[PDB]
């Protein structure tokens, strides 16, 4: 690196939490000094509260300003529900179909293919179900998931491995359900 001067960080977070669409909305404003949250306003509480002793004077000082408080107490409507309405169509309601592929892999360097991997990628939202079949019969044991990986670009991926050493005549199926499709996507593979 370089320049080891000491650092001083302040973070502000306004968290709008939404449950069942906008049936319940909660604002949590959080003030953080050096990774240490010091003070917050929770709309369910309705005034500032000190999280550590460092934040107390702010709590007291801001709670003393009646017009600032009334603004924050209205923020669930004027800020949270407003912004939910602005972004909903391209965020909450975003649907992108997954790409599915199956390829063989190995648990250890050198030894032969002892896995089938079903890669599910490019999809949004995160809700996905993956099932493995060998000759149309579901494989339950030996199935292992990475779970959900966020790519940083409004897509996810996940890898679902089946422990198996494929033999000729076996047809393996990866089947995938996701909100973007009304029937399951299936991809077949054979050795």
């Amino acid at each position: 690196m370089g320049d080891t001067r000491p650092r001083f960080l302040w973070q502000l977070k306004f968290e709008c939490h939404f449950f069942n669409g906008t049936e319940r909305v909660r604002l949590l404003e959080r003030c953080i000094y050096n990774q240490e949250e010091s003070v917050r306003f929770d709309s369910d509480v309705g005034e500032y509260r000190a999280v550590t002793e460092l934040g107390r004077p702010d709590a007291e000082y801001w709670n003393s300003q009646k017009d600032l408080l009334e603004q924050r107490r209205a923020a669930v409507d004027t800020y949270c529900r407003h912004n939910y309405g602005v972004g909903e169509s391209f965020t909450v309601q975003r649907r992108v179909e997954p790409k599915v592929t199956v390829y063989p892999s190995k648990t250890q360097p050198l030894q032969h293919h002892n896995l089938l991997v079903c890669s599910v990628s490019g999809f949004y939202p995160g809700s996905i179900e993956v099932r493995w079949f060998r000759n149309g019969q579901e494989e339950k044991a030996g199935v292992v998931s990475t779970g959900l990986i966020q790519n940083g670009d409004w897509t996810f991926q996940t890898l679902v491995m089946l422990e198996t050493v494929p033999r000729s005549g076996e047809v393996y199926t990866c089947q995938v359900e996701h909100p973007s499709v009304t029937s399951p996507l299936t991809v077949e593979w054979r050795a």
Partner: protein, 185 residues
């Protein structure tokens, strides 16, 4: 299942003596937009979002100014206590399954660190590469540490090796995260 909770977070920060500030919105862990401080502009994470919403960047600059003024007050109040360095964990993966000679993207995922100052270098066969690279701003975490992504478009090959080199004040030496084609899983 239909997802029950969603969270939108407007996350800001100011860091001294760097004098670097950031303003961004996060939805369920993905960046909706940030404001570029030098250019003073709203930058939407996907170009198409800006066809649907707008954001006045000048307001974000005003917030960062208040945030600056509070940081300085807090810095005295805490009697100049500095942030403790927390070094990142790094993961490199591809965004799609790797096929020989089919264009792909390497993803360097830098996680669980603070302060938000990091150097990331893509190395192909031990030599820096910059062609086509892109990166995100710092993204928030519930524990108040940061996330970041860097991206390297590439053409998979049996001959090339890659390293994401990450440097940070909390690391003794640069962290080298290796990737190559056909690695076991």
């Amino acid at each position: 299942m239909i997802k029950e909770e969603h969270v939108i977070i407007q996350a800001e920060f100011y860091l001294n003596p760097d004098q670097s500030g950031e303003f961004m919105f996060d939805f369920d862990g993905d960046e909706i937009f940030h404001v570029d401080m030098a250019k003073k502009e709203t930058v939407w994470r996907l170009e198409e979002f800006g066809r649907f919403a707008s954001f006045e960047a000048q307001g974000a600059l005003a917030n960062i100014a208040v945030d600056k003024a509070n940081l300085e007050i807090m810095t005295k109040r805490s009697n100049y206590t500095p942030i403790t360095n927390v070094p990142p964990e790094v993961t490199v993966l591809t965004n799609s399954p790797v096929e020989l000679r089919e264009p792909n993207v390497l993803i360097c995922f830098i996680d669980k660190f603070t302060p938000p100052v990091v150097n990331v270098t893509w190395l192909r066969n031990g030599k820096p590469v910059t062609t086509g690279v892109s990166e995100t701003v710092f993204l928030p975490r519930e524990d108040h540490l940061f996330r970041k992504f860097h991206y390297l478009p590439f053409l998979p090959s049996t001959e090339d090796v890659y390293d994401c080199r990450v440097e940070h004040w909390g690391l003794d030496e640069p962290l080298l995260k290796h990737w190559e084609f056909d690695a076991p899983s």
